[PDB]
Structures are given as C-alpha cells and as structure tokens.
Write a protein that binds this ligand. Sequence first.
Ligand SMILES: Nc1nc2c(ncn2[C@@H]2O[C@H](COP(=O)(O)OP(=O)(O)OP(=O)(O)O)[C@@H](O)[C@H]2O)c(=O)[nH]1
Ligand SMILES: Nc1nc2c(ncn2[C@@H]2O[C@H](COP(=O)(O)OP(=O)(O)OP(=O)(O)O)[C@@H](O)[C@H]2O)c(=O)[nH]1
Lengths: 75, 118, 427, 74, 51, 438, 72
Amino acid sequence: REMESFYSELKWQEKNTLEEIDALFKHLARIQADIACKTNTLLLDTKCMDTRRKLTVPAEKFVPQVDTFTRTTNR
Amino acid sequence: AVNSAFSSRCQELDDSLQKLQYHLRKTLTEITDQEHQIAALKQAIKDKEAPLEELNMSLRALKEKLQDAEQALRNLEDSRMSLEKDIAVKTNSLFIDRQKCMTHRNRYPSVLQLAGYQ
Amino acid sequence: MREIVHLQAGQCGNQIGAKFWEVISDEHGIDPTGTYHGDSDLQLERINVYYNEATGGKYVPRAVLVDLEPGTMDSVRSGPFGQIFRPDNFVFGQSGAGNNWAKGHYTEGAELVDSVLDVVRKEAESCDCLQGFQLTHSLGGGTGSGMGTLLISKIREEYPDRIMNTFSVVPSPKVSDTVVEPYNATLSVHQLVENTDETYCIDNEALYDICFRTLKLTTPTYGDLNHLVSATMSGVTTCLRFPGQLNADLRKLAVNMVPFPRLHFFMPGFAPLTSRGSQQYRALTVPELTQQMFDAKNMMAACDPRHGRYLTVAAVFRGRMSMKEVDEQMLNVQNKNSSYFVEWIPNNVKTAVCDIPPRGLKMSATFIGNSTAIQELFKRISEQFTAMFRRKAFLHWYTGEGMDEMEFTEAESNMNDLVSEYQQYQD
Amino acid sequence: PVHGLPFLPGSSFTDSTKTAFHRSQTLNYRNGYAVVRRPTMGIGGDRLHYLKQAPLAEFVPAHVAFDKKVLKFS
Amino acid sequence: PMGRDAAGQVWFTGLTNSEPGDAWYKLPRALDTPYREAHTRWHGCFQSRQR
Amino acid sequence: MRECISIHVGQAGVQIGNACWELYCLEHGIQPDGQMPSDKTIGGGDDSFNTFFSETGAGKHVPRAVFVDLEPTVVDEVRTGTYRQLFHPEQLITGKEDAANNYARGHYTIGKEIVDLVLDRIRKLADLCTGLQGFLIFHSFGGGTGSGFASLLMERLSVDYGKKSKLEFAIYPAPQVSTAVVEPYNSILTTHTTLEHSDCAFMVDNEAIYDICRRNLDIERPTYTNLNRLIGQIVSSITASLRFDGALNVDLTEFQTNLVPYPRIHFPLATYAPVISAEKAYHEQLSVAEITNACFEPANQMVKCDPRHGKYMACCMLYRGDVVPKDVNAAIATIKTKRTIQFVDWCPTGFKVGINYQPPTVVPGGDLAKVQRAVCMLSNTTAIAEAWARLDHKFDLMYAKRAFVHWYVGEGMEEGEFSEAREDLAALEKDYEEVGVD
Amino acid sequence: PRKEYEVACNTGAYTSSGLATAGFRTAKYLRDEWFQNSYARYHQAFADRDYSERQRHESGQLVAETGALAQR
Ligand SMILES: Nc1nc2c(ncn2[C@@H]2O[C@H](COP(=O)(O)OP(=O)(O)OP(=O)(O)O)[C@@H](O)[C@H]2O)c(=O)[nH]1
Ligand SMILES: Nc1nc2c(ncn2[C@@H]2O[C@H](COP(=O)(O)OP(=O)(O)OP(=O)(O)O)[C@@H](O)[C@H]2O)c(=O)[nH]1
C-alpha cells in the first residue's frame, strides 16, 4: 500500500512540472531517478510476495508466475 | 571401525563450512565496492554532460560501460544467493548427524555382558 | 601517534614544496579537490602522519610557507595544486630583501618571527606527539638563509628533543649567478653546524649531468629537477607510514648514522633511472639494482666519494624483496673494496626494507651516505672567502646593516675546525 | 598521453602553444588587515575549479469506570 | 526446466499438510482438500487388512 | 595444570609469535574464529589446549600471551589481520616511540610508564593460572626496542616471582652481518644484565638458517616466513612433552636439573635434523641412525662454531613420532663410541632421552616435508666461546675510539657500565676455558 | 566426451552410479562427483569475482581518460 501511494503522487508531481516547462530541469532529474529506484523496489517486492503461496496452496497448483525472466549471463 | 569412519566424515564436512564462510565475507565487500563505483559513474556521466561530436562518441561508450558494469553486479548477487542456500543445507545436515547418531551410539553394549557375565 | 609539520622557506622552497606536496598527494591518491579515493587502505589509515583532517573527507596540508617575494606565492597559488593549501597560513613580508644575508637575518625578520612562531605552535599543540620538523630551504640563497637561521635558532630551545631536519640546496661549484652567495653560505653554515642535527646538501651541476647521462632529454624543466629531488624526499619518508618491518624513525637512523656532534651533512642518491630505451634492455634484478645504486655516476649531490673514504652508509629499499639478495650483495661489495672503508668500525652499512613500493616501478631504493668528501666543497669555499675578504670589497652593504667582520672571524675558524676534524679522523 | 600515467621523476608532459604570460595578483595589503584574494585566473588566464500515555484508558480510576451504571429488569 | 532457465526449488510431498480423517464436522469437504483418492482408498483397504 | 605464559618484546618478537600461533592453532584445529567445532570439548576449559588456551564459556580460545611493542605499526597491523578476534585487544600493548636502539634510552626514558600496565596484566593472568611453570620470552640481542624493556621488566618479574624457571630464546648477532652499529653496545649491555637472571637462555642465528635453507631445503628465495616457521616448529617440539602424551615424559625442570651443569653457564644450543625438501624425502629413507648422524654433522647446527674445536658438556635429545628404544639405545651407543666427538673426561654419559608418539605436523602451504620421525637436539658445549672472543676485540676498538657515546651520556648513562660489562664478559670466557680444560 | 569418461568409470563388476543417457538422474550421489560439485562452486565464485574487479579497473581508466580529454 504505502509504496504504491508514494509512487502515484510522485508521478503526478513530475507530470505537472513537465507541462510547466534551470533548477526546474535539475528537479526533473531528481524526480526521474527517484521514479526509477521506486520501480525497482516495487518489482522486487512483488517478486518476493509471489513465493509465499508455497506454504499454503495445494501442491499440484503452485507455479510462481511473476519473473521467470532468467537474467544471469556468463555461465 | 564404524566409529572412526563416522568421525572422519564429520570432520571433513566441518572443514567445508569453514571454507564457505571464508569466501562469503570478501564476496559481500566486493559487492559493496562495485556499487560505490557505479554511483560514481552516474555522477561522472552528468559531469561529462555539463560542458554542453567526439563528445557524443565518448558519451555512447561510457553508457555501454554502464550497462556491462550493471550486468556484472547482477551476476554477483546470483552467486551470493546460491551460496547462502547451500550454507543452510550444509549446516542443517551437520546438525542432523552430529546429534542423532553418536547420542544413540553411547547406548552401545559392553563386551562382558555380551559374553553374558561369562 | 607520530606526525610531522612541514616548513617551507625561500624562493627555492616555493617550488620545492609544490612538487613535494603534489608527489605525496598523488602517492596517497587524493584528487585535486581534496576528497578521498579508496583503492589502497594502508595509505588512508596512515595519512595522519602528515595531513590534518578537514570535514567532508578533505585532507589539508600541515605546511607553513614563508617568503618575502610575493610573486612566488602567487604562482604557487595559481598552480594546479595550490588550492589544496589553506589561506590561514600564508604569512609573508611587506617588501623584498635583495637577499642580503645581514638584512635577511636581522632587520626584516623581527616583525614576522612572532606570526610564524604563533602559527607553527598552534599547529604543534594541535598535533599529538611530534618526531620533529623538516625544513625545505636554501643555504646559498639569501632570504631563505636569513629567515631560516633565525627560526632554527629559535625553535631548538623550546623543542630540544625533536628531529630538526634541514634540507637545502648548495651553490654550484662552477657558476652561481648570485655573487655574495659565498658570504650567505658562510654566515648560514656558521649557525647551521651548531644548531641542526641532520642536513641534506645537494647541488645543481650534478642534476644537469644526470640529465645528460641518463635522462638524455635535451630540454628539462626546473620542475623536473624538483621531481628528481622529491623522489628522494618521498623515499626517505616512506617507511614511517607503511607496514612491513624496518625500524624507520629518522632518529633510529641518525644515531646509527652520525658518530659525532659536528657531522651533520649528507649526500643523497636515487635508484633506477632508465634511459630512453634501456627499459627493456635491463633485467630488473637486485644485483644490478645495487650495482647502479652504489656508483660514481648515480650519485648526484656534491662530488665523488672517490677522493676520500666512507664512515657510514644507509640504504632504504622499497619493494617485494628478501633479506638474502641485499645482504649478500652488501657482503660482496664489502669484499670488493674492503679498503676504502674505515677499519675504525666494521659493517658500516645500515639497511632498511619496506614492502609496498611506489607506483610506476616495482623495485626501488634510496641512498644516503656520510663519507669523507665534504672537504672538497668546504675547502673551495674557504679559499674563495680568503680571496674575497682579502680586500673585503662589497662589504659596505654589511657595514651599513651593522654587520662587522668579527662575525666572519668567528665563522671562518669554525669551518677550519670542520675541515681539520674531517681530515683528522679518517687520516 | 594516458592522462595520468605513472608520473615518474623521469618523464613528464610538455607544451608549446602558450603565448600569453602574465601572473595574476591575488595578494595585496589595501588596509590595516592584510588581505588575500580567492584566486580565479591562472597562468596566462584560464579556468580553474572551485510518548506512552494511554489513548483510550489514561487510567481512569475504577470509580468513574463504573459511576452511574445500573441494569434495570422486569 | 532443462535449458537456459532453472529454478532450484523444493516442492512439498503432501502427507502432513492435510486433514485425512473423517467426521461430520469435516464432511462439508471444502473443495480445497488435496484428497487424491489413490493413497486414501489404498489406506482404507490396507488398514482393513492390517486390522 | 601444565601451563605457561608467553611474552614478546621489541619488534623482533612479533612475527615469531604470529607464526607460533599460526601453527599452534592447528594441532588442536582451531579456526581463526577461535571455536572448536561441535565436537564435545567446550566447557570450563580442560583439555590438551589447557596448556596453551583458556577457552571460556563463550567458546573462544584465549592465548596466554602478551605482545608489547613501542610503535603502533605492526601491532595495529596484526590487529587488522585475520586473528584480531583470536587475540585479546589489550593483550596487544602499544607504545608510541622508538628506543633508537639506545638501550639506556629504552631503559630509563620510557620504561617507567608501561611496566605498571604489563605487570598488572601478568598478575591478572597468573591469578587464573594453576600450574604456572613459567614463561617463554622473546626478545633480541640486537634489540631495536626489545633490549632495555626486556632487561627492566625481567628484573622486576624476577624479583617478584622467585619460584619458577625462565626461558629466553634470543636471535644472536650475526657474526659478520650487521644492520646496526649500536648492536655491539646494546648486545653486551643485555648480556651482562641477563646472564645472572636468565634461567635457560638459548641462542639462534639467522645466517645459518639461510645456509640450511639453500643447502637442503633446495629453496633459493626464502624469508622470515620460512625462518620463523621452522623456529616455531622447534619451540613446538620442545613443548610437545607438555602438549601430548607418550611412553614417558620430560619437563623443563628436568631440563634445568640435568642439562646445565653448574651455576652461571646456561648457554646451550638447539638443532633439528629432518629439514628436508619434498623431492629429496620422496625417494630417500629416514631413520634413527642417519638422522642422528646428520644432526651431529657440525654444519647442521645453527651457530657458527666448531664442536671439533669445542668439548662437550651435555645433550638432551627428544624424539617425536614413532620409534623403539631398541634402535634408540643401539644408535646412541654407536655415537657414544664415535671418535670425533670429544666428550669431557667428566661426564661418562651425556644423553637425556625423551620420546613422544605424536608426530610433528605441517603448516598449510609451507616448505618442510611430510615427516614421520623428528628429533630435537639440545646441547651444552664449550665451542660457543668463539662468538664472545670475536665480539670483545671489536668492542674494545670501537670504545677506545668512543664514537656515538654522546647519545648515551647526554641521555644519562656513562662509561662505567660499559667498563663493567667488559669484565663481566671476561669472567664468562675465563670460566669457559677452564671448565673445558680437564 | 563426458560419455566416454562415464563409460570408463562405470563398467566393472563393482558398483554403479546410474548416470543415465538423458532425463532425470538418480538422487543418490558419489564421493567423486560430490567433491567435484564443491570445486565447481569454488571456481564459479572465483570467475565471477575476478570478472567484476577487472571491469572496475578498466572503468576507472576510462573515467580518467575521458575526464582529461574533456578538460583539454
Ligand atoms: N624555486 C626555485 N628555486 C630555484 C630555481 N632555480 C634556482 N633556484 C635556487 O633556489 C635558491 C634559493 O632561493 P631562496 O631559498 O628563496 O633564497 P633567498 O633568501 O630568496 O635568496 P636568493 O636566492 O638570493 O634570492 C636560489 O638562490 C636559486 O639558486 C627555480 O627554478 N625555482
Ligand atoms: N624474528 C624476527 N626477527 C626480526 C624481525 N625483524 C627484524 N628482525 C631481526 O631482529 C632485529 C630486530 O630488533 P629491532 O630492530 O631493535 O626491533 P625492536 O627493538 O622491536 O624496535 P625497533 O627500534 O623499532 O626496530 C633486527 O636485527 C632484525 O634483523 C621479525 O619480524 N622477526
């Protein structure tokens, strides 16, 4: 909940500044970076919340289905 | 002979855990250092942005380096998570054998009473 | 802990300090702004040996800089590192001097010694436990001599337990432009012999000879000269701030080094100087390191130790070495000429080894020696003095200052004592 | 030029195109206090870098906790 | 998966995350019961014989 | 029970300790963390470690030692090494200044304000100590800072404890190698101090360590690492009797009683036979006869002296590993009827034999071989007089020219103590040649 | 490749680890492959760490290069 609320208000403020358009551009920079980090946080959080069902759901049904996007490269 | 073999097994497994944590510490420190330098890299690309052709080509090369550094970081944490899971398994198994077996083995009988008060 | 406060005097000192501080700075790895950069840690932990901490990870010099000529200060201020200095400390004078020795020691310093003393004593209280002071100055230069003899005379009594290292520049044996430079030399040395404890004496001609023999590089800069001497300073001060055995206190060396109170002057030496192409024509091995190390041409301070004999030597080494190669090398050379030494004492070598080298080159070394070869310089100057003082020309300026010749009389026989005593022991 | 190669005492850089040679004056006297400027222009002229209470209880005493409370039954 | 993807996970082998018994307060039989009839009926007959 | 306490002074005494514990952890198998595994030993602190460590309720073994230096560099180094948790922080006592190799400087200028702390620490260990047989002291005759502090604190602890032995293991001056010119000064000062209060002082020299290193270990670039490794193995061998069990046992009390003949002369030598390289041991054979022959080979000793020019007083030999008294006695009889070794007409026997079953162990990544039968050799000889006979005729010269004396006189001492050390040394020699004479 | 070595190792009248052709293999392991698993973990860690530190080195060199180029 609380992360989502923070994210939404951040986007609205950024948008208003956008239609308003030096320090302004600087603040655009800070807001943009903040949005990036917030997205990373929420995605990791959903990833973690996925695996909880393993302790409760009947065995045959469990399959994660969030992020089977295998990212590791070198091998 | 059973006793001796069992002891040797346990000792070897303990040594394995030793090696594992020895690795983990400096692994984490390296991770932190990589993150520091990457943050410095974002700051540096903004610094390079400041004075605004050759410049353009340089900026593109720098951003490519951003990408591969981030890739290295992610591989790092994958290795890390593997290491902790295996740590957990190994420690649990060592508890298992270092508690059940020898404690029940102390109950072993004695030669004279196997001879039946001979 | 153990810490040092650096003193810079005279127009030589102006650029000397610049080169020396930038060398140590980029050694420890500090940006021109002053923010730390962590790549090696031991340097960071031991930076307190010289630097004073400033908030936000900034590291100010513990330098005190003085001259009378303001343009030198302005150039240092404008240099690519001068911003690192602190405006608090630029005590200076209100005119020129004409580098007359009597003026430089008696009239002008009267109103500035107070300020310089207060600044340095504030710094001294701030720090914890001082090994001593190092001064970068000139003995042939006028205003440096005038201020420096005053300050070194002042400080000894308050701090008579402390290592008062003096590092100077000696006039050319061939041509020096400055003409009353002799008289500067005699008056400076007269105090310095009594007052100092250790003094390094180096000359420019051999630097030029080095430029021709090994640099080969046609057109140098006096900045590059200062680099070649800042290497020696970096070396001689390496050992305090770094781990790996070598008992490194300059006093730990000095007691081992000097046999008698009137023997303070020493003759430096550097390690591998590689030519344009010999970099891959040399096998960088300890034997040839020592071979070039102790040579008649690698030496660059005053004159060949050939003319006399050695009392004592001290060699510092920096790099991943072992005992053996250096120890047996010393035995080999000891056998090679067991004659030019003094049967006075055996094993007159001091060796010191530290494991973390400078950067750019893996192995490195620095030499310092006390040998019976100062008589050349001091003879030369003594006959110059007798010849000039014969009809005492140009002494009117000193008469006007209030200088009168009895001070010349008192100094000249002190140098006579120096010459006679040096020759007396070894012969 | 490796832009920061090991600055050995041996070698260093060298430049030739400079013509304008003037020294900036940042030190002067001007009054009782000697005065030192922040230097801005370098050699020749060039750019440098500068509470636990109880919200619902508050411990009301029992007397008030049960004052004037009666149950009425037929 | 055997290939570029792999998850080293641990699946439950269900016997204890279960309510096997029978009674009226259990007969409503909410459809979330993992009640694969094979081993249960096999039990039924097996306890019957073991008795 | 059978426990002792360790002290290190001067910066020569710190690498050697560092190595001694780098080894001593292993034979009981303690990681740099400091915890025996779940194998059932933890409790109040009773098991074979007890002689070395006091592992208390937290499960952390505790070295019974003190490392005092006068310059924070190396002490902070080791405090930043792996074993900082292993050591007790203030057991690592740091000073701030150097002795300048000036013995009197280190003995009067600064010695007055750390002895309190160090002796208080000694008391707060000796309280928990039970057997308190004695102490193992590491200093250096070429003491850069060890000399004066060692003399002063040793005198204080000698007067405070008068009921136990004291062991000193000193790196003796290199006869033709010097990194110090004040070395003869502080060396003879330390000698004429210590000879009356050291109970057993053993010498070792390092040139010969190198000589062995490139004779039989086949390595041509060794260092302190290998030097101190083998030296630590030597002290491990001499403490193995306390460490493990065996057929029969020996102790430092017997070492004193039987090794040293008389009062005063207590300057013996140590020797180790099976220092052999990996390939050299691979396809060769080792046993009692040849190891004894190689040990009494004169050049394998670690002091530049000739026993053939000397005459023998005493010998204690310790065998570690698996042996049998049959071969023991047979071989020692062979040596007894050997010909070059001139035993004095005094002693008909000279051999104190000790055995222990537990073989010596390797260090990980080291240099020595995988040995099964090791042996340590301690000996009283008359051959050592040459070292002092050499030192005296250097010191007399350099003192008749009395260079460097200004340092000492200006810091407080004077020529009288030097003059007295002269005749103390003279008495030493004078006793030695006459006891050597039949 | 591995095929030849597994054939060589598992052929005799002694025991047999069912290292099949393909598909899921037997859960039980043997001492040799167990030690191998450990060594594989260790070398994987070494490779990853060294790669990262290499990257940081040339990154620092590039930063210095570009900064000085711009400062010209
Ligand atoms: N800093 C610097 N010093 C130099 C240079 N070239 C020669 N020197 C020498 O450094 C000497 C010392 O200067 P100072 O210590 O400031 O002496 P001073 O009291 O000002 O007296 P004078 O040297 O007569 O001006 C000069 O006498 C020169 O001989 C150079 O390029 N830079
Ligand atoms: N065993 C051992 N010996 C060393 C070590 N380092 C040096 N030595 C030798 O032992 C002597 C060291 O004594 P000192 O140099 O006086 O050291 P210190 O008294 O602890 O204090 P310093 O004056 O600071 O050196 C030297 O002659 C060295 O050759 C070391 O780390 N371990």
